[PDB]
Write a protein that binds this ligand. Sequence first.
Ligand SMILES: Nc1ncnc2c1nc(Cl)n2[C@@H]1O[C@H](CO)[C@@H](O)[C@H]1O
Length: 385
Amino acid sequence: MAKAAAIGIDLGTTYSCVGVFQHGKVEIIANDQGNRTTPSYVAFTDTERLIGDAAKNQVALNPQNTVFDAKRLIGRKFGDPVVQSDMKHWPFQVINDGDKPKVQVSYKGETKAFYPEEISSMVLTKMKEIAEAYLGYPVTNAVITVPAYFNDSQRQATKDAGVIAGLNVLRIINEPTAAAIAYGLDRTGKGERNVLIFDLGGGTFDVSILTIDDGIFEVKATAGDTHLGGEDFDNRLVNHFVEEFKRKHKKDISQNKRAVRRLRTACERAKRTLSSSTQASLEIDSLFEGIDFYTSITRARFEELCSDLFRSTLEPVEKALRDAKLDKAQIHDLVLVGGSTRIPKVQKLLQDFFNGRDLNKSINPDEAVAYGAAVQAAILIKSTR
Ligand SMILES: Nc1ncnc2c1nc(Cl)n2[C@@H]1O[C@H](CO)[C@@H](O)[C@H]1O
């Protein structure tokens, strides 16, 4: 029953996703708000702890006590220059507990501090309860994914997050490996298979090159930008609309925190529409000083606004190829991961770089990692018996 069942969890920087392999198919499990992915956010309020959508939904009202980006801290020492650099951009406090970072917040009127694995365990507990509500029984066996570049300390702290969350961690697997499993790229028989995974998420960009030799995975190269993602494209749309509002009304809205956040969420929404329509409409009632902001933008203008950022995704692709010592024609498969890979211009740039090659994109790119983890969790629990 529950003991013969296992889930796959993609514990993402900005969003998490959970899947289960049963009756010959992967089911990506929708949360209680009907969403197939859940924000990796934990909010501490005057009455409760919120996780996911409810936590992300109140971030503007409670920024000091809304934790996100715990994955950027997990398994790291406080003195790590990555931690010191990132801390300057977070509205929540990060403290030092014997060279270990802790996020410090106000919860039920009291000061509390949490290790990154404790924050990540609250996200994992939510994914576990989402799976349990779908299945009708508690599932505790899980495969959890991590970036291919995570070291032993980051992998161990992720497993520790799983244990705190009440999960039996069958294995910690690499995200690009789970994505290659999702497409069955490890079951093509004999001979070395070179796979490139292009993973453009909400806040990070990762390029991974793997060689699959008779089911055995080997990481040949990892490249990318830890501070490039979908939110930079949302921000480019924001600056455009701030300048358009100034041209139409001779008013600068950039200082009105509420106006900027409402514009930001509307921009994120319009950006998604632009992946399947050649235009998107913004409909913001009383954006600033009672002025409605009803406008539109073409996909062509959006592509211009992010042109330099889309083009910059090809430098880590070339860098990974040189590190792996492979030419483009030596790559057998191209896999898309991350919601931002749905952007048609991004697909076109990657396909043209690989000389007109087909892309593996039939699985929801924001779900491919949880999909593969779910497949691996099923194989692993079946071998355990
Ligand atoms: N249809 C889409 N077109 C463009 N961007 C998208 C799309 N879906 C998602 Cl999710 N994202 C973005 O992916 C990230 C999460 O993986 C977020 O930045 C989200 O906006």
